[PDB]
Amino acid sequence: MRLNTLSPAEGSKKAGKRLGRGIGSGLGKTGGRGHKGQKSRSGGGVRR
Amino acid sequence: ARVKRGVIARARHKKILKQAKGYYGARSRVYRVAFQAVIKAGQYAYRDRRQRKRQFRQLWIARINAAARQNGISYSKFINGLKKASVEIDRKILADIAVFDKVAFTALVEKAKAALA
Amino acid sequence: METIAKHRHARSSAQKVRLVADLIRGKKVSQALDILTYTNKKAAVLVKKVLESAIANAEHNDGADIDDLKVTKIFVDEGPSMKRIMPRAKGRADRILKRTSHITVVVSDR
């Protein structure tokens, strides 16, 4: 093989979620957090 | 790896302003108002595809009604006679003949009048 | 022949110079020079200077025939606007623009 033919097995990489990137990515504009509240704030959330 | 997003923002704004070439005022120049104008033009094109499919049928109905009433039968009894004589010529072609050739439309009036009474 | 002559960074506004520039667009050059002579505007003096420079360049750098000549195309565009600061009441400043302009005249026989 050459070094530009090694592909991973299918389902290895998932490429992740990128929150806040528009209407088309699904999540975006609140990025999955929903609307206001303690769970929506920067560094928000209850303790264990 | 820092990405400078100038060239792609220029491509993205020119992609809009080439579509809004022809609107009045700063809907042709300003990117923001041209963006609103472009999506509003898209919604209008969708709704007006449906509206065209209604409006042209109502135009053909008005033409068939006028050309039939000139020949001596009203429109509703014309279509009743054309269906009870089993003629499946839809209204676009009937309006086309009703404008172009009065002879075949008069023959269709005779067939409908014979089929009615 | 085009015989362009321009004056760049003319220290006056572009609009006020443009007002007298719309006077002589499409004239025979003698009527233009006398009508810029008898105008009561400073921009008339500016465009008269540019017009004599254009007429002299059209008679010098190529051959002749001043009487044939007709001002085809004159235009004034806006030049580099320089900034100052105007002090106003209650401590707030105002950035005011001293505006400059480019005057350009193009005369020809046809």
Partner: protein
């Protein structure tokens, strides 16, 4: 192929005479509006004025049904402080005799430039004379 449309420079028109004696105002004005829009011709397209010219003789003999001679009121506002005027029907027979048919046909037309042109086609006259004899108006009967 597309559908047919009437080009405005191709339009032919006819001239007509209506006798309004004893025919009621609304039904006569209805037939005038139907003839004025061009809905009697097969070459009808809604953005082109196609309807015929119409001349009306005997415009103050036109009668209304029931008690409408004395009770129907034709309001209009002068656009002022609160000066809103009116007239009854027979006062409009006396004062502005053709204007009853003018308002009654203007109410039944589309509102815009094209409605204004097809209202310009209407030539009402109170007297039994008409100066459009050089136009040769034939007779149509509602």
């Amino acid at each position: 192929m597309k559908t047919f449309t009437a080009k405005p420079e191709t339009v032919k028109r006819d001239w007509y005479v209506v006798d309004a004696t004893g025919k009621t105002l609304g039904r006569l004005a209805t037939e005038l509006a139907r003839r004025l829009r061009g809905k009697h011709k097969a070459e009808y397209t809604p953005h082109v004025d196609t309807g015929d010219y119409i001349i009306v003789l005997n415009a103050d003999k036109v009668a209304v049904t029931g008690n409408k001679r004395t009770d129907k009121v034709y309001y209009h506002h002068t656009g002022h402080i609160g000066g809103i005027k009116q007239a009854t029907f027979e006062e409009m027979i006396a004062r502005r005799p053709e204007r009853v048919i003018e308002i009654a046909v203007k109410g039944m037309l589309p509102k815009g430039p094209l409605g204004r042109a097809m209202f310009r086609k209407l030539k009402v006259y109170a007297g039994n004379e008409h100066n459009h004899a050089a136009q040769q108006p034939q007779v149509l009967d509602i």
